[PDB]
Amino acid sequence: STASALGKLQNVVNQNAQALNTLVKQLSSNFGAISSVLNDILSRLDPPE
Amino acid sequence: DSFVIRGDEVRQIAPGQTGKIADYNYKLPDDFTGCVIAWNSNNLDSKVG
């Protein structure tokens, strides 16, 4: 009947899932470059920059 | 390597440079080592005809 008695295992699962999800999410950042996708940078500039 | 070109095109002799001469007549490598010498021969290589 009573739930929330298994906090530790659920916490471990949530931590792993959140870490993996944010690692995946980081791909969309810019890091100060012109764009966040390689193809746009390649297909809009000569290699010097 | 020696040649004679027009006055305006001297800026096209550089690594990673583009234009009309750098892509059709003489292309320099991106990692070029060595260097370039240029001077003016108007009173010698230019004729009234």
Kindly determine whether residue B30 and residue A47, on different chains, have CB atoms separated by under 8 Å. yes
Closest CA in chain A for residue B18: A46
What is the Cα Rg of chain B in Å? 12
Cβ partners under 8 Å of residue B13, min gap 6: B21, B22, B26, B28, B36, B38
Place of tokens 């920059």: A49
Resolution in units of Å: 2.9
* B16 neighbourhood in chain A, CB within 8 Å: 46-48
Contacts 24+ apart (CB under 8 A), B5-10: B7/B40, B10/B38
- A49 contact B CB<8A: no
* B30 neighbourhood in chain A, CB within 8 Å: 47-48
